[PDB]
Design a binder for this molecule. Structure first.
Ligand SMILES: Cc1cccc(C)c1OCC(=O)N[C@@H](Cc1ccccc1)[C@@H](O)C[C@H](Cc1ccccc1)NC(=O)[C@H](C(C)C)N1CCCNC1=O
Lengths: 99, 99
């Protein structure tokens, strides 16, 4: 789909059996999700945004379906105000910017 | 241009007679620039990211040229680690996401 930017580019994802809304985010290197129930092992990590740092859990090779396109990769889980799909996954669904 | 997302989507901007590099950022409502010399009047404001909140200065109707496309709008100025072009300007240069 082509997505214009008059509203937040929010898409429906399926991750770990659950349905969520997430922001397609070209200004995010990584993918950050709200506190959620994920299976597997992790490594403590800190994500750094505007205004400072959040402690996150890092899960590798997690399956996600973003607007019906499958991607496998790293997902961060922690106290983000909004679910963020970052460029690590955007590249996998063939996502481009166009102007 | 079409921009893939294997690297940060950094473009050259001209703002207030100066040249800078900024991130085309679909996950940003607003445009935030590092501390810089801007002319005019302002209003104190707080921008809120992943780590909490930064105090910024809000300037209205500021001309920016982003990859050679002029846009006029609100620019926020403050202690961001990266220059961010938000959807408020991205819509003016006809920027879309495509997958
Ligand atoms: C950079 C990065 C590296 C690794 C992993 C991750 C998730 C990374 O990205 C984290 C990040 O905050 N990226 C920002 C841009 C970024 C990259 C590098 C350094 C600093 C920032 C931006 O794209 C997303 C983030 C989302 C958000 C946060 C809080 C509330 C609402 C939305 N959006 C915002 O902060 C914007 C700002 C820029 C005007 N924002 C805040 C006011 C409300 N609305 C809004 O749109």
């Amino acid at each position: 789909p082509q997505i214009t930017l008059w509203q937040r580019p929010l898409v429906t994802i399926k991750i770990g059996g659950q349905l969520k809304e997430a922001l397609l985010d070209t200004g995010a290197d990584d993918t950050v999700l709200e506190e959620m129930s994920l299976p597997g092992r992790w490594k403590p990590k800190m994500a750094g945004g505007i205004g400072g740092f959040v402690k996150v859990r890092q899960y590798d090779q997690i399956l996600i379906e973003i607007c019906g396109h499958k991607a496998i990769g790293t997902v961060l889980v922690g106290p983000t105000p909004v679910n963020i799909i970052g460029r690590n996954l955007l590249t996998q669904i063939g996502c481009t910017l166009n102007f």
